[PDB]
Amino acid sequence: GKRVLIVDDAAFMRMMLKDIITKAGYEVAGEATNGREAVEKYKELKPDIVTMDITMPEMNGIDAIKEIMKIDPNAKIIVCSAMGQQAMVIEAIKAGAKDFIVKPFQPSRVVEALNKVS
Numbered sequence: 001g002k003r004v005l006i007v008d009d010a011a012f013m014r015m016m017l018k019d020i021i022t023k024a025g026y027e028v029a030g031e032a033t034n035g036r037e038a039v040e041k042y043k044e045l046k047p048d049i050v051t052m053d054i055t056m057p058e059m060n061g062i063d064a065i066k067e068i069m070k071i072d073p074n075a076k077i078i079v080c081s082a083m084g085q086q087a088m089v090i091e092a093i094k095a096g097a098k099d100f101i102v103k104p105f106q107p108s109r110v111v112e113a114l115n116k117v118s
Contacts, residue, residue: 001048001118002025002026002027002048002118003026003027003028003029003045003047003048003049004021004026004027004028004029004047004048004049004050004051004114005028005029005030005031005032005038005041005042005045005047005049005050005051006018006021006028006030006031006032006051007031007032007033007034007035007037007038007050007051007052007053007061007064008032008033008051008052008053008080009033009034009053009056009059010053013053013080013103014031016105017051017105017110018031020105020107020110020111021051021110021114023107024107024110024111024114024115026049026114029045029047029048030045030047034059034064035059035060035061035063035064035067036064038050038052038064038068039064039067039068039071042068042071042072042075043071046072048076048118049076049077049078049114049117049118050068050075050076050077050078051077051078051079051080051101052064052065052077052078052079052080052092052097053079053080054079054080054081054085054088054089054092055080055081055082055085055103057088061079061092062088062091062092062095065077065079065092065095065096065097066095066096069095069096073096075096076098076117076118077096077097077098078097078098078099078100078101078113078114078117079092079093079097079099079100079101080100080101080102080103080105081100081101081102081103082102082103083102083103098116098117099113099116099117100113101113
């Protein structure tokens with residue numbers, strides 16, 4: 001109930017997040033750079049939580065949310081967005097995501113999101 005799958009194309013953002021996740025005592029089940037991989041790794045790892053980057057809509061992360069819900073209507077998915085993406089956040093929340101964080105990350109906020117959702 002502590003395994004997280006991180007989805008984000010930015011290697012460095014991924015790492016940062018891992019640092020945070022890990023220090024807060026959670027565990028990194030795995031990493032993905034895009035929606036398809038995520039789905040595939042989600043099926044393979046059955047992670048506890050999923051962190052999903054939605055900054056670039058052309059990546060269709062929202063569609064991945066949905067794909068995963070089909071697969072597990074119990075999935076707990078947090079979404080990373082950037083400032084001013086409130087509309088996407090709402091669509092993601094609309095599609096099943098439980099919460100959202102904003103870049104640039106505030107360790108405390110991410111820990112809180114994680115915890116709330118766990």
